[PDB]
Amino acid sequence: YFQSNAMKTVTVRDLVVGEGAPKIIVSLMGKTITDVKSEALAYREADFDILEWRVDHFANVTTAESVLEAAGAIREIITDKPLLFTFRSAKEGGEQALTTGQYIDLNRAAVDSGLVDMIDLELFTGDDEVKATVGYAHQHNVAVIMSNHDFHKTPAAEEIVQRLRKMQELGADIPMIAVMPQTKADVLTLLTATVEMQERYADRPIITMSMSKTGVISRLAGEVFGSAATFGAVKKASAPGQISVADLRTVLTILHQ
Amino acid sequence: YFQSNAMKTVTVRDLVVGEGAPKIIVSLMGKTITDVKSEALAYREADFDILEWRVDHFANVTTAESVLEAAGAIREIITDKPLLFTFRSAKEGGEQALTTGQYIDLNRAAVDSGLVDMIDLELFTGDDEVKATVGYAHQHNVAVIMSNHDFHKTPAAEEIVQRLRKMQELGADIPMIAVMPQTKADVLTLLTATVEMQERYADRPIITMSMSKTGVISRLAGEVFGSAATFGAVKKASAPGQISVADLRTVLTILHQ
Ligand SMILES: O=C1C[C@@](O)(C(=O)O)C[C@@H](O)[C@@H]1O
Ligand SMILES: O=C1C[C@@](O)(C(=O)O)C[C@@H](O)[C@@H]1O
């Protein structure tokens, strides 16, 4: 993959994240290899840019062989889209829990497989562990989306910016933050932080969102405010506020014009 | 017309402004009677809710009979959409100048015609004459959109809110403000003022917009943030940032559903 600090872009495959209209990410959440393959097949007909595999939804996550088998199955079905490997931790709202060591080993195994283009690492996993794993990913030509989630509130704009800057400091290729609005003002706080980060500090693409139906604007206005990607739902949403993939592309295309 | 402070609505004909998805306004901008008639024909296959006649684009505005005939010509083409009579003053970006007295007489004549459902009165016309004209419009069953426009900058949110509050105080059925963003933050300023005024405070619908391409998101997000209507373009836009009416309705429907 490539990255430019001037264009503030990350290029994975031929996809240029940070240029033009925001890119669409869709999450695959199957429990079994059968569910993963059927979802992948169904998704192939959809118009998205990046496939996020939510590995925390996978029952056999603790069996190394099974994870590799599922990654391979996805790659065989969805052959022309970057594959993002994401174990969302229990701490940050994931479907199952792993020790820090297990979580880092899981991500290292994904990097080593050569089957995934990007991995998601959580900002608050631990500095030593994050830096070591970012380095390992980079040594293997795998990009890192570094993430943070607040499912119950929206921190101050200053705190949101501080977290995004810390992700940059840790070597994140793409800093990403998702927060929960409790008011309409909270949605605008997330957008304010997005504009501030993108205009003042970012030298790479960032991804931001205010969850829930109230925060939907944050999933649509990335081109003007400075969010490089957005999540859409093919069937079931991976988080509240996501709109259908078809509708999402329609809105982004309208805004790009 | 009707109006309710329960649901913060204004009902003109069967159209309920302030309920559900934002309503769409399009502007008619012809120089002569036959120009406005031809434009009205062009607009008839478009999906919009309210027809704004931009009377300041009309060459013979000082000839009362000409203005009446033009209003009549419009109503011959467009029979199923409320007609909003708007002379945008030179001071606020209009295409020609009229004295305050001429402007007030023009609006009173529009009210008397029985051909217009609504009139636009500018907040900064003069408080006393605005109050008197609002009273006259109301006595003749004509609703009033009270407006303010800043085509060059975005005032502070507190100032935007003060203006919207003053419009309520002066009797506006629908306060309306349009401002010009010079930075991305300015768009957020306009949305912030929209929420501050509208959310659990205003007792009637309001219309707000951040103009230009940078502010287009403000024309789409009214259902969440609190703007009851939005302007689109059929052929030529009447202000920078308006997108096609078809595209506008597409996004509004996506966000309502
Ligand atoms: O980080 C994100 C963001 C997300 O939470 C959203 O709100 O769209 C959806 C998750 O699957 C993904 O890992
Ligand atoms: O008040 C408005 C708003 C507007 O300026 C706009 O930005 O859509 C278009 C004008 O025709 C109308 O009178």
Swiss-Prot record, chains A, B:
Binding-site residues for 3-dehydroquinate, renumbered to this chain: S27, E52, W53, R54, R88, R219, S238, Q242
Reaction(s) catalysed (UniProt annotation): 3-dehydroquinate = 3-dehydroshikimate + H2O
Regulation: Inhibited by (2R)-2-methyl-3-dehydroquinic acid.
Assembly information from the UniProt record: Homodimer.
Source organism of the structure: Salmonella typhimurium (strain LT2 / SGSC1412 / ATCC 700720)
One Gene Ontology biological process: aromatic amino acid family biosynthetic process
Listed EC numbers: 4.2.1.10
Family the UniProt entry places it in: Belongs to the type-I 3-dehydroquinase family.
Single GO MF annotation: 3-dehydroquinate dehydratase activity
Pathway entry: Metabolic intermediate biosynthesis; chorismate biosynthesis; chorismate from D-erythrose 4-phosphate and phosphoenolpyruvate: step 3/7
Sequence intervals crossing the membrane: none
Protein name: 3-dehydroquinate dehydratase
HAMAP family to which the protein is assigned, alphabetical: AroD
Active-site feature positions: H149, M176
EC class (word): lyase
Domain of life (superkingdom): Bacteria
